[PDB]
Amino acid sequence: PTVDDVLEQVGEFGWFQKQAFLTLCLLSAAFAPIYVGIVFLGFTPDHRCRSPGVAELSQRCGWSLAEELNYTVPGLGAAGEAFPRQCRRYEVDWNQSALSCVDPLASLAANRSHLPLGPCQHGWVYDTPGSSIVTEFNLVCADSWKVDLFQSCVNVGFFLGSLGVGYIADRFGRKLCLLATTLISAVSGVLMAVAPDYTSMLLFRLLQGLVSKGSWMSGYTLITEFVGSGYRRTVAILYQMAFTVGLVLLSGVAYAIPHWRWLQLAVSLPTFLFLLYYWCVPESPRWLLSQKRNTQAIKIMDHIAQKNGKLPPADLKMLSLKEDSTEKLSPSFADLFRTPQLRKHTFILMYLWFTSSVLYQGLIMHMGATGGNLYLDFFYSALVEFPAAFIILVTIDRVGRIYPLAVSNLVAGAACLIMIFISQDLHWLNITVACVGRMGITIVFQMVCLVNAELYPTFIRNLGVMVCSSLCDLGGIITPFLVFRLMEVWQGLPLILFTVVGLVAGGMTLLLPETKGVALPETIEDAENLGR
Ligand SMILES: COc1ccc(CCN(C)CCC[C@@](C#N)(c2ccc(OC)c(OC)c2)C(C)C)cc1OC
Numbered sequence: 001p002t003v004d005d006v007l008e009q010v011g012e013f014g015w016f017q018k019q020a021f022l023t024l025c026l027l028s029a030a031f032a033p034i035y036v037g038i039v040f041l042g043f044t045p046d047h048r049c050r051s052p053g054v055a056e057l058s059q060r061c062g063w064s065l066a067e068e069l070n071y072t073v074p075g076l077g078a079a080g081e082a083f084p085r086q087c088r089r090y091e092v093d094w095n096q097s098a099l100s101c102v103d104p105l106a107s108l109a110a111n112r113s114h115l116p117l118g119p120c121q122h123g124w125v126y127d128t129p130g131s132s133i134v135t136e137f138n139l140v141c142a143d144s145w146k147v148d149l150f151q152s153c154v155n156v157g158f159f160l161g162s163l164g165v166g167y168i169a170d171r172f173g174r175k176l177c178l179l180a181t182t183l184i185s186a187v188s189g190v191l192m193a194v195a196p197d198y199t200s201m202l203l204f205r206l207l208q209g210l211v212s213k214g215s216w217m218s219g220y221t222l223i224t225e226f227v228g229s230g231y232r233r234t235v236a237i238l239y240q241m242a243f244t245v246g247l248v249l250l251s252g253v254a255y256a257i258p259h260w261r262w263l264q265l266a267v268s269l270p271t272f273l274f275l276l277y278y279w280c281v282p283e284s285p286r287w288l289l290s291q292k293r294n295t296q297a298i299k300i301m302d303h304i305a306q307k308n309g310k311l312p313p314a315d316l317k318m319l320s321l322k323e324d325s326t327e328k329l330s331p332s333f334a335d336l337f338r339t340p341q342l343r344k345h346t347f348i349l350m351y352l353w354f355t356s357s358v359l360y361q362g363l364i365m366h367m368g369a370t371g372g373n374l375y376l377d378f379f380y381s382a383l384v385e386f387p388a389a390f391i392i393l394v395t396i397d398r399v400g401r402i403y404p405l406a407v408s409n410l411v412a413g414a415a416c417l418i419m420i421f422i423s424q425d426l427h428w429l430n431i432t433v434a435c436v437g438r439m440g441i442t443i444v445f446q447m448v449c450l451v452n453a454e455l456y457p458t459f460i461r462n463l464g465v466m467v468c469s470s471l472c473d474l475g476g477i478i479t480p481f482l483v484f485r486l487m488e489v490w491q492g493l494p495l496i497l498f499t500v501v502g503l504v505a506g507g508m509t510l511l512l513p514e515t516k517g518v519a520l521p522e523t524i525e526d527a528e529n530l531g532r
């Protein structure tokens with residue numbers, strides 16, 4: 001009367017599992033807006049210093065947008081690539097000075113650079129018709145650093161949330177966390193759009209970052225626990241695919257409405273619908289059974305059999321763990337580093353997370369010049385992930401879960417290496433090589449997530465995956481400074497480091513035990529002898 005066999009009897013993947021998976025995938029997309037970052041709220045368009053006198057002249061004679069930028073604005077390329085043109089204003093009186101359209105300012109100085117440069121007051125004039133956060137608070141020239149501060153604060157919030165949000169989810173249940181966390185995320189999201197100043201917006205976004213990953217991973221571990229042992233692959237890969245579909249829909253809607261506040265409100269409000277559909281999914285049977293609440297576990301098992309339509313087994317009355325467990329099974333950070341096998345697995349997984357994040361950031365940084373349309377580039381980037389899900393879904397149960405991950409990490413490393421050594425000049429080959437590298441990186445990410453979830457015990461699974469994921473955020477935060485610093489030492493130093501890191505990660509992946517078709521553990525002592 002173990003949880004595995006009885007679950008198979010009612011059905012590993014039945015209508016109940018299908019409905020629960022669909023309801024959770026509805027939640028998967030809601031994490032795309034929070035994780036994408038500030039790419040759609042903080043895009044910086046072209047900008048010049050507003051001038052009152054230009055408005056009067058704009059109507060007197062025929063004008064064009066390109067023409068106006070040319071001989072009304074200070075020229076670029078002097079004392080910087082575009083520092084003068086971006087946020088410097090000559091301040092020469094353009095009003096009550098009828099110098100003709102042909103020679104508006106040429107006559108006065110007979111030279112452009114030598115002209116007088118005044119302050120860039122009167123705010124700014126931006127190109128895009130829509131409004132972003134940069135346009136809202138004029139975070140353009142003097143406060144340009146504030147965007148980096150916002151991004152870094154959001155990232156450190158992510159890191160803290162990874163470190164801490166796991167314990168509450170693990171100790172107090174997975175449904176309670178998925179409810180409170182998503183509720184806080186929703187109530188902050190709609191609140192950010194009504195944020196008056198720069199501080200409040202940043203605070204609400206920091207809170208949402210603290211809570212979002214906790215919500216997403218609670219849902220992931222809930223669905224993984226619900227699905228049978230054989231079908232973990234399908235559920236996990238489809239959850240990731242649902243996240244990608246949410247990302248694509250985000251790109252589409254972001255193109256639909258540019259205004260950042262309306263975007264945030266439209267993205268946040270639908271989360272209340274999912275909060276309304278919390279009624280469907282009950283607590284994971286495994287967590288309840290481990291916590292010694294067998295009555296509710298059997299009550300739930302009766303329901304799944306009912307919804308499945310297959311008669312429940314008569315043996316449920318004696319449902320329990322394989323061996324008589326202790327009264328208390330509380331999760332704690334202390335228990336995560338006691339068993340040498342568990343400690344080794346945790347270290348390997350943390351290093352794999354860090355390597356994946358660093359390699360991803362390096363690959364995206366070393367990409368080619370950005371396209372004219374940001375939205376199309378983002379859509380293509382999201383689309384490249386679907387082939388990864390197609391590939392991973394067909395090989396996990398036929399070749400295992402260790403060799404694919406090792407080969408994917410090594411493939412991303414070799415992609416970086418070929419980018420470095422072989423000619424990196426603009427060619428059709430380079431874009432395809434970058435796409436292959438991106439596919440390898442996303443395969444690494446998804447495989448690491450799945451194996452890390454499947455490796456830890458049921459009563460500490462969420463905490464372990466959280467702690468191991470925190471290193472991904474740490475690497476994402478730290479890598480830009482590392483790449484900037486190393487570039488000074490030598491021209492191509494960063495890519496050698498990327499290649500060696502990838503090779504070492506691929507090598508270390510081999511130590512991790514295989515998990516092809518093995519029931520996920522429920523006791524730490526059981527997880528210690530998993531390999532044996
Ligand atoms: C610049 O825009 C982008 C921003 C981010 C990305 C992300 C690339 N990958 C989809 C990352 C996969 C990592 C991800 C998975 N799977 C993940 C899973 C578990 C994690 O730990 C619990 C985790 O850590 C943050 C990330 C998702 C949920 C974010 C692509 C982008 O291109 C579309």
Ligand SMILES: *[C@@H]1O[C@H](CO)[C@@H](O[C@@H]2O[C@H](CO)[C@@H](O)[C@H](O)[C@H]2NC(C)=O)[C@H](O)[C@H]1NC(C)=O
Nearest residue numbers: 066067068069070071072102106107110111112
């Ligand atoms: C950019 O602005 C300069 C203004 O100095 C333009 O140079 C003028 O070009 C016209 C012909 O298009 C000549 O008749 C003028 O004599 C030029 N000015 C001077 C001071 O020699 C230049 O053409 C502009 N370029 C664009 C693409 O708008």
